Amino acid sequence: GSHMIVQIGRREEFDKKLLGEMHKLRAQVFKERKGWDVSVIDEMEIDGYDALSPYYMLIQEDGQVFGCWRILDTTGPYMLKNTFPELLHGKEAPCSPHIWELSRFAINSGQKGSLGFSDCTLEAMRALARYSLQNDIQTLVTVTTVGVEKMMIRAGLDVSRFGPHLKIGIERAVALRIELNAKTQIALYGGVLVEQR
Ligand SMILES: [Zn+2]
């Protein structure tokens, strides 16, 4: 009713309408960014990875998607391995059921973002790291910018890079590994996450 709702699930679990607002948000963010292998179809940023069984995280507020993130198994194709392999610096692309890739961070930038943005991200990572840890994941990898990298090294996460950042489009982009260990967990939650069964 005025609070934040976060959903995390497989593409198939979300209503064609929510998906359409997610991809519109990604278009509002990524439209005509060059170098990020973007395709906008009918005002929606959607690509072949979306047809590979991704998970999505959506943050909502007053009935609208304000932020979204995509998650891909590293046992299948993912953007670091198959779109941005230069950022690997010749290292091997991870491939494991315990590691996932994040991509397509998109946050509505307008007036109606009622939480902030340093934090919007915080909240997303809290929900994301937990969903991942409960699905036996130890590591998140992603291609993002140097900006988000520092935002994350500052928030305390344990974050390391595969190699030097590179100019992608108008950005300085880098491939990160985000360990979901104790240090991350404590940064995110104030301590070690404990799940009950
Ligand atoms: Zn509410």
Swiss-Prot record:
Required for the synthesis of PAI consisting of 3-oxo-N-(tetrahydro-2-oxo-3-furanyl)-dodecanamide also known as N-(3-oxododecanoyl)homoserine lactone, an autoinducer molecule which binds to LasR and thus acts in elastase biosynthesis regulation. Belongs to the autoinducer synthase family. Keywords: Autoinducer synthesis, Quorum sensing, S-adenosyl-L-methionine, Transferase. The keyword Metal-binding does not apply. It catalyses: a fatty acyl-[ACP] + S-adenosyl-L-methionine = an N-acyl-L-homoserine lactone + S-methyl-5'-thioadenosine + holo-[ACP] + H(+). SUPFAM superfamilies: Acyl-CoA N-acyltransferases (Nat). GO terms for biological process: quorum sensing; signal transduction. Its EC number is 2.3.1.184. It holds the Pfam family Autoind_synth. This is Acyl-homoserine-lactone synthase. The gene is lasI. It comes from the Bacteria. GO terms for molecular function: N-acyl homoserine lactone synthase activity.
